[PDB]
Amino acid sequence: MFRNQYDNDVTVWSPQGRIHQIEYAMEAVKQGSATVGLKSKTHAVLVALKRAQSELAAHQKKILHVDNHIGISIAGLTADARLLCNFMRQECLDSRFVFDRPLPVSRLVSLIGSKTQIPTQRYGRRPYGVGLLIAGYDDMGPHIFQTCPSANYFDCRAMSIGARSQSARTYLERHMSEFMECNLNELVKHGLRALRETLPAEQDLTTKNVSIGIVGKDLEFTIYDDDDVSPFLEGLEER
Template sequence: MIFLTHHIPWNSPSGKLVQIEHALTAVGSGQTSLGIKAANGVIIATEKKLPSILVDESSEPIPVTQLVRETAAVMQEFTQSGGVRPFGVSLLVAGFDDKGPQLYQVDPSGSYFSWKASAMGKNVSNAKTFLEKRYTDDMELDDAVHTAILTLKEGVLTPSEIADYLEEVE
């Protein structure tokens, strides 16, 4: 999460929400992340991070749409409330519930959209263009993982990082 440490007016003379633009800029400079919804699941890929021992892996099941809607509502509230600033993050939310695999992207403004495949971060244009060429509705998880690695390879990961991913997948 990025916290803005200086005061930025909410609105510019043109009527734009300046803090939302700054939050979107912060998201755009972050690590490239992408999500792909396959026929039998959803994957999210990004730079490898070590898991924290503080993560509680047991949680109450919740429909994916409800989770996204509630998270987006909190983010949207922070764009309009006095004394708080918008979240400087976008989220890729993947889940599997009674409606099957789902992938959503939530922006700092609180807007959210359902996606078949999406990307965000530094190389978003290249990644989305690559995903548009490679994605198919009948894609299975193995194909989605392969497509994610190829997408990240297009300018995000080094050859040794790709080798690490391939070892973990196999």
């Protein structure tokens, strides 16, 4: 009842020592479909769940392309995702053009965090309302990261974000023991099995709402849609 005066701006401290606009922005990530990411000793994969508004429409793109070795998945607002993707593409292109050497994923994530922190302190702006999952490969091996609207990033190893992601996160936490010593087929199988937990126990993981992105040592970033995901799906068991 006493929150009315202390939650209309991002430059105002509450008497309890909290900023409510940051939490409100963080509440916006749970407005999108669930996405799942995990890695192994050689490869890193991204699995997303496409959603169409109705039958007479094409599902929107949830997995974007940044560089020859970096790819992302989005959940939340769309304009913010587009702006962040443009920034990442520009940074990677500039670094490649100047130094003739790929931009490291850690430096990219640090730059993203430094850019995102700014609009949470000054007037006339609002926090970004999108959460990202970044997968890449460099000299240090496969990587996977997460980005929060509060300008925080975590160097996780298997994470899922979006609406109703708790079941997928629980499954990943249970089965994370046997991820390092696996190859691509069963890695993708584990990812799909984890993602299937989000859906109610009446639907199915059909070949119309699944997007897969794979990066590796000798394999560049690749996106499979529609009939391209068929070879990755026949081996799945029943619910």
